[PDB]
Amino acid sequence: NNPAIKRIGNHITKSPEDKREYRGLELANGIKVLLISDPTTDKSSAALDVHIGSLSDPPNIAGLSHFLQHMLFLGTKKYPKENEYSQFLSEHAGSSNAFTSGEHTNYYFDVSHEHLEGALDRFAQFFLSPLFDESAKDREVNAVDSEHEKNVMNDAWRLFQLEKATGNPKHPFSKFGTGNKYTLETRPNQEGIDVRQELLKFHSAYYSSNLMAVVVLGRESLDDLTNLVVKLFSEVENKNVPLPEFPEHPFQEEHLKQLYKIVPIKDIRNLYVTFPIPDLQKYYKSNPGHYLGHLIGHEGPGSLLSELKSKGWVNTLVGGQKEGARGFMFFIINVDLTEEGLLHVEDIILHMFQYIQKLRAEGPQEWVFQELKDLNAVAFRFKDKERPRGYTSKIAGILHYYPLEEVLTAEYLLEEFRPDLIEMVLDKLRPENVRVAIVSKSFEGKTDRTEEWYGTQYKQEAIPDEVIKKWQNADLNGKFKLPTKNEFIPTNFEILPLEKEATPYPALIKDTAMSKLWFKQDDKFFLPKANLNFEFFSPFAYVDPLHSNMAYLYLELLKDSLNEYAYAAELAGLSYDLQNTIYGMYLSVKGYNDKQPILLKKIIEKMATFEIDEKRFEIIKEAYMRSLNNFRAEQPHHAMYYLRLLMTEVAWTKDELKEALDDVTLPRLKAFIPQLLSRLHIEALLHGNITKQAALGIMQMVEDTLIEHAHTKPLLPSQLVRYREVQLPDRGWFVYQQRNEVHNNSGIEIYYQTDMQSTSENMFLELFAQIISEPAFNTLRTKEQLGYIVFSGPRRANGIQGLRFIIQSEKPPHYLESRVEAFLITMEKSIEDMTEEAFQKHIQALAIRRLDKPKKLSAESAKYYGEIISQQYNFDRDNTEVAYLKTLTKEDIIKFYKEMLAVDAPRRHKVSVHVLAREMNLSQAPALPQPEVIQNMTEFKRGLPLFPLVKPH
């Protein structure tokens, strides 16, 4: 036997398509483990999930377990350097993150496959001896504060906390989990708390092996992975901590039959209906709540949504079970509201209860369960191979809930038909345990309560006994019918043999005036799926703000019109994306190849013969107006949006679109559509389980459907225009300044434009960014604590590129600027001082990043798709660019920096976007020139040259 191992699990049930090998085990100290051996993987990975989270925070230090999560990255006894962990990952093509929920704290990384042990050794120390360094603590409290700051004016986060504030205040559910400077520093200081000791005590009390689950994925054998995990994780102490449990629901009697009227930040209009329920987690083999969610949340003919939409009351609906914690759950039915729907909330809810009564009247349906089961089994068998980092993180969470042997299957395979459970949950969905919340600007000034953590304005009322009784008497409405058999359920899963003329990259198999067809039969994944991507080119989609508006409305009305039909396909693993672009339209159809030609045909047919329902036009127009207005409530880092506007030849602002929108009439839209479709060019990628002849057939079916119904003719080659990037002058510095009216933080984007994309320019820029990537985070966030959001990397647009920095902060942008410049000098010196081997590690790390193989079809499709829509068509880019990268020296990167990037660089091309807050041993910052302040974007663009477009490969 082995004393360090309590038990090795039996065979871990997996898909027969899954070539990864698995071993489950439990260590002597109680840690549940899953080992995943993948000898092909480019990146290895591990995750650990501790079954403790913010619900276990001390009542007097809100945010403590989340603060602890940040602090674990900042040094341990074995590895005391504050950024040892993150630096090691960066230098070895790795990445890491962590999250805290109510009951879990989950930590994960990936890394180059040959450096798993080194990454895992550093990771393991988090759970053994963190330093909680006193200086680290005082700095990092600002990252958490800034994290909360960004959430404060976010409508979703405000509602999340409001639900908690309106249940039983004595229940742990009411806790504020994020924490901030006040809860984590200021108040603790006022009350004599040694926060470092509190962190040490919480870690000591709760970071117990018996509450932990670890997952490791690597190229190593299952035996080698076993020895690794035993080696590193056997020393975690078992303190036999009881798993927290919350059997009493936070919503008791006095919290039920309540109405909440809420003022949002954005101009949004929503209704939230919720019912307290028992914890259904244990019923995973039958899943009664999913069955009810499927039915109540259905969007097909006869559904709840269909009738509410027909009445003109709501546009979208989400229904089903929602997690609480061990011991409690919620069942929800949430809808957005039209203006008319806001006046008919009572009637909307009556319809909800009529639908529920129909479920009660028909009884549980085994055939519905069977579909659900069948679909889940197909989904499991043919699941796309996951990226290691997300996969390990997900399994570590669910190891706490299922037997070892079932961790892969448990969330998919359904086994038991349980009409007793379906009825039991259905018996909870009654007017006497309903909570109702309306979110609307119309409640502005009419509220009398304030939620303390976010400031949310609301009013709480008892629902009148007469309203309840009316809902209790809901009878059958003839508009409500159960769904019928889902005919999109796929049955043909045959993988076509690999054709003799098959190619490693997409081949251009059709090149006509009307269409350009790129094709690749899948030679890697061998799942019965395909991706069909189409760009429709028409200059008429973006000619002016009006036409851009009409393009948008057209496609939104089309999706709205197809919804009832497309929903069945979606349940059956067949989806589509349809959107307007600056060049025309984009269509993507993905999923099981079987029924895929049928959905595609329907989309093009509907496109080309579209007739608009006037009521839907008016509703969707009003939603779009609000959507344009609501951009005002987006986050300051806005900065990105202004830079895009500034740097692109043609771009309509949100303001211009807003103005043009009133001029969108039904007559005008009806005229626009045939004009849009009259002349087109189509560029397509058809990629997956499909032959050349099926691909050619699909392409021509799309053309013929347009030709037939819309009389489409080809666009002139010259009309296939692409937009250029503005060309900044040597040594120029421009600043554009605006104010964010909603958020009380600044945002900045700094762009150092370099030159057109090419092999050499690409790799100079990418190597530099690789070298500065971790240091920028470490310097600008960890040390200087300028904000939660600190980003650096290549910016690529319209065939041009450069280096960008994005920061969101309480500090003014002019200050942010001087800190980024101080940082840039630090990096020049750091590049001078680094060893030739440190330099080569960064080359190798970038190389691994660029060569990492797609694990699934759509990831491979997206790479080819990027080559196609950018018109570079460089399908072998990675090998070619990496071969050149390996050639680079320190002097090359120094010369590049000195020529293009240094403050005194002869070819420095700098543009800054400064977004001001609503209310508006540090290294030496260099002196900066006076910027030219941009007053008018049009004038700015007029006064500068435009770059060329990049030549196709």
Partner: peptide
């Protein structure tokens, strides 16, 4: 249709 956590480092 059928069916908030704190990051980062």
């Amino acid at each position: 249709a059928y069916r908030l956590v704190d990051t980062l480092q």
